[PDB]
Backbone:
């Protein structure tokens, strides 16, 4: 699973012991679900609307993995 992959790399970093917190916001009629994860002092989230909570975790996990592959910061 994609979520599992985070743990694999997270543990490989000397027991990172990351934490994930779900963020709920928006109007009651149109609720918004997001997934947030802490990574060595750097927290990432997925600003996307997901039908289910599990889906939100998937999106958030993808973002975290992308950062690892490429920081995206230059000069």
Residues:
């Amino acid at each position: 699973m994609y979520k599992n992959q985070l743990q694999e790399l997270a543990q490989r970093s000397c027991f990172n012991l990351p934490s994930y917190t779900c963020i709920r916001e928006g109007p009651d009629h149109a609720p918004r679900f997001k997934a947030t994860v802490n990574f060595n002092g750097e927290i990432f989230e997925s600003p996307q609307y997901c039908s289910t909570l599990r889906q939100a975790e998937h999106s958030a996990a993808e973002v975290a993995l992308n950062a690892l592959s490429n920081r995206g910061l230059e000069h």
